[PDB]
Design a protein around this ligand. Sequence first.
Ligand SMILES: N[C@@H](Cc1c[nH]c2ccccc12)C(=O)O
Ligand SMILES: N[C@@H](Cc1c[nH]c2ccccc12)C(=O)O
Ligand SMILES: N[C@@H](Cc1c[nH]c2ccccc12)C(=O)O
Ligand SMILES: N[C@@H](Cc1c[nH]c2ccccc12)C(=O)O
Ligand SMILES: N[C@@H](Cc1c[nH]c2ccccc12)C(=O)O
Ligand SMILES: N[C@@H](Cc1c[nH]c2ccccc12)C(=O)O
Ligand SMILES: N[C@@H](Cc1c[nH]c2ccccc12)C(=O)O
Ligand SMILES: N[C@@H](Cc1c[nH]c2ccccc12)C(=O)O
Ligand SMILES: N[C@@H](Cc1c[nH]c2ccccc12)C(=O)O
Ligand SMILES: N[C@@H](Cc1c[nH]c2ccccc12)C(=O)O
Ligand SMILES: N[C@@H](Cc1c[nH]c2ccccc12)C(=O)O
Ligand SMILES: N[C@@H](Cc1c[nH]c2ccccc12)C(=O)O
Lengths: 65, 65, 65, 65, 65, 65, 65, 65, 65, 65, 65, 65
Amino acid sequence: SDFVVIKALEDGVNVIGLTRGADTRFHHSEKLDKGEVLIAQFTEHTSAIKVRGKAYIQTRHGVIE
Amino acid sequence: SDFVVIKALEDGVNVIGLTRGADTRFHHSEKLDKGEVLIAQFTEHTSAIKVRGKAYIQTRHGVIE
Amino acid sequence: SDFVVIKALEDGVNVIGLTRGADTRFHHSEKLDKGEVLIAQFTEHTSAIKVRGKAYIQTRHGVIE
Amino acid sequence: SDFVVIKALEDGVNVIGLTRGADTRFHHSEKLDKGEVLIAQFTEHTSAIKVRGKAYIQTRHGVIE
Amino acid sequence: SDFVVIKALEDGVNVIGLTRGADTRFHHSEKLDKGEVLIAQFTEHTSAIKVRGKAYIQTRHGVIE
Amino acid sequence: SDFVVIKALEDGVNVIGLTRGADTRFHHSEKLDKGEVLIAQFTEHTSAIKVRGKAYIQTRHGVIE
Amino acid sequence: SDFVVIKALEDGVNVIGLTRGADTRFHHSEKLDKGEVLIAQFTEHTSAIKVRGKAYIQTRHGVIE
Amino acid sequence: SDFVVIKALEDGVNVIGLTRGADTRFHHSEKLDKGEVLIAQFTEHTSAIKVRGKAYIQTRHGVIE
Amino acid sequence: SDFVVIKALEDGVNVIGLTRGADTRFHHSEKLDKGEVLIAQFTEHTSAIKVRGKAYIQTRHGVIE
Amino acid sequence: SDFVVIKALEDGVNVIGLTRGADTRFHHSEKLDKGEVLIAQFTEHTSAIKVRGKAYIQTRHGVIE
Amino acid sequence: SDFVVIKALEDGVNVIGLTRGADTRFHHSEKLDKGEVLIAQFTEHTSAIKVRGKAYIQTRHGVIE
Amino acid sequence: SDFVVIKALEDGVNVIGLTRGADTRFHHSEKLDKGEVLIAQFTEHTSAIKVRGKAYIQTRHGVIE
Ligand SMILES: N[C@@H](Cc1c[nH]c2ccccc12)C(=O)O
Ligand SMILES: N[C@@H](Cc1c[nH]c2ccccc12)C(=O)O
Ligand SMILES: N[C@@H](Cc1c[nH]c2ccccc12)C(=O)O
Ligand SMILES: N[C@@H](Cc1c[nH]c2ccccc12)C(=O)O
Ligand SMILES: N[C@@H](Cc1c[nH]c2ccccc12)C(=O)O
Ligand SMILES: N[C@@H](Cc1c[nH]c2ccccc12)C(=O)O
Ligand SMILES: N[C@@H](Cc1c[nH]c2ccccc12)C(=O)O
Ligand SMILES: N[C@@H](Cc1c[nH]c2ccccc12)C(=O)O
Ligand SMILES: N[C@@H](Cc1c[nH]c2ccccc12)C(=O)O
Ligand SMILES: N[C@@H](Cc1c[nH]c2ccccc12)C(=O)O
Ligand SMILES: N[C@@H](Cc1c[nH]c2ccccc12)C(=O)O
Ligand SMILES: N[C@@H](Cc1c[nH]c2ccccc12)C(=O)O
């Protein structure tokens, strides 16, 4: 499965997993402080990922700066 | 499954998931504030995605803005 | 499955799904207003997609405008 | 399955599906007026596609102008 | 399955499908007027395609004219 | 399955299918007149193809003339 | 399965595995001192990886520093 | 299955199929006169191909001139 | 399965295999003298590899030193 | 299965097939005259090929002469 | 399965196979004298390979000199 | 399966097959005299290949000499 790389560029960045299925809700919010990184897959339970806060992101489709 | 990357360039960008199957209706609306990102897959339940609001988008076919 | 990216360049763009199978009818018309984007897969129920109105389109085979 | 992209360059363009199987006949004719686009797959029921009228076409093998 | 793109450069171009199997005979003749295009697959029933008339052809191996 | 493209450069070109199996015989001879094109697969019944006469040939391994 | 390469650029770097499944908790924290490298897969039990501390990271999508 | 392209550059070229299996013998010799082409697969019954006489050959590994 | 190449640049480089599964602990420590190389796979039993000591490392994602 | 192309540059080039399995012995010797070519697969019965005599050889790894 | 190429650059080079499984031990040491080459796969029984002594090594990830 | 190409550059080159399995012994030594070529697969019975004597070797990972 595909994954995304998220580096926080400030404190309090939020990486949020949305549930896979007919129901869509937030199931987890991971806090990243400045400089911390989360490398997160799409999975059986996560089919969309939301990022709140200033972050540098890499995916297969390129960079978000 | 393929995914799309949506960066909101204004508050209130709406990412709308349309139901897979014989019938087509929206099943989820996810709102993004300016600078927020949604990385969203096509899934068993979502076979089309509509984006309303000023956004920067990446897919396998490149950039749409 | 393949997907197409359609950005409306004017109000009232229509993205129309044609039924997969022996019969061919329109099963859904998605109206896009100017600047809205639809990212739509080919699916069990949709084997052809018609676009009416001024639009910018990306597929695996390139850009249409 | 492969698909083709057809943009009408004049009114009254006709995209015609030919039946898959031992029998070959037209099963559907889709009319495109100037500037309209059809993105159409090969399918269980369609193994050849005929285009009548002035059109710009993209397939995996390139462009017809 | 592979497909071929045939653009007629004169009226009456004939695209001829030859039967798959131990026996070989034509099972279908599709005529194209000048400027018309046929996009045709190899299939369960068609294992060779003959083109008669002045035409521009694309296949996986490139252009034949 | 692989296919070959044969364009006759003179009248009376012969494209001959050889039988797949322990035995090898000619099962079909397709006559091409000048400018005609045959696009022919390897198949359950054809494992070698012989061409007699002046022709332009494309395969996956390049051009023969 | 995909893997990530993490080189600690200071003492006390923490590479944290998050549990695969409906629930998300930290199941392991691997402490890296300066110059140590961890090469870690995504696995049945780990579907997201968090990195705290100054580190140089390689994944399939590029370098993070 | 792989195939080879053989063009005779003189009369009396011989393309010979060797039997697949524990037994190795010639099962077929196809005569090519100057300019004639044989496009021949490896098959259930042919696991080596011998060419006698002046010929131009293409395979996946390049050209023999 | 992927593998990593580790060249020790000093005596006593430690290549440490971490257990695949719900639990994480080291199951093997392999020491390398200066100039020695270990080429090590990810496996049923090893889902993360830790390297301690000055080393030159190659993986699919490039060089880490 | 892979194949090799062997062009003899002298009379009496010997292409020798070695048996697949626990035991290794030659099971077939095919002789080539100057200019003759053998295109030979690896097979159920042949897992190594020895060439004796001056020859030009192509394989997936390039040219050996 | 992947393989590695090891050329000894001095006498007494040691290529050592480590056992696949929960248990890790040396199961074989192959001695290479100057200029000798071992081409060795990863296998059911070998999931890590250790090289002692001055050697030139090629793997899919590049060269160790 | 992968294969290697070995050209002897002197008389008495030895290409030695090592047994696949828990045990490792030499099961075959193929002597090559100067200029002879052996093209040898990895197989059910051979999981490592040793070369003694001056030789030119090609594998998927490049050339050894
Ligand atoms: N529960 C939704 C989540 C989702 C994925 N992609 C989306 C795009 C738009 C809206 C919601 C989604 C699903 O699995 O389909
Ligand atoms: N329910 C439709 C949604 C859809 C996907 N692609 C489309 C293209 C056009 C219109 C609707 C659609 C389907 O699954 O097929
Ligand atoms: N119902 C048709 C729709 C279609 C797909 N491709 C086409 C091309 C031409 C005409 C119709 C079509 C089918 O599934 O086959
Ligand atoms: N019914 C035919 C349609 C067709 C496909 N490709 C063709 C080429 C030539 C003529 C007819 C065809 C088939 O499925 O085989
Ligand atoms: N009936 C033949 C048609 C054919 C395909 N390729 C050919 C090449 C030569 C002659 C005939 C053919 C077959 O299926 O095999
Ligand atoms: N009947 C033969 C035809 C053939 C294919 N490739 C060949 C090469 C040489 C001679 C004959 C052949 C076969 O199926 O194997
Ligand atoms: N338990 C979650 C962990 C996870 C993976 N990717 C994520 C993205 C965001 C939040 C949590 C996650 C899962 O397996 O799905
Ligand atoms: N009957 C042999 C033919 C063959 C293929 N490749 C070869 C190489 C050398 C000698 C004989 C062969 C086989 O199937 O294995
Ligand atoms: N036992 C863990 C080991 C592991 C792999 N990748 C990791 C990343 C972070 C922490 C631990 C790990 C697992 O198999 O999942
Ligand atoms: N009978 C041996 C032949 C062989 C293949 N590759 C080799 C390399 C070295 C020595 C012998 C071989 C086998 O099938 O395994
Ligand atoms: N027995 C171990 C050997 C091993 C492979 N890769 C490793 C990395 C580090 C330590 C040991 C290993 C295993 O199969 O998993
Ligand atoms: N019998 C061993 C042979 C072997 C393969 N690769 C090796 C590397 C090192 C030592 C021995 C080997 C095996 O099949 O695994």
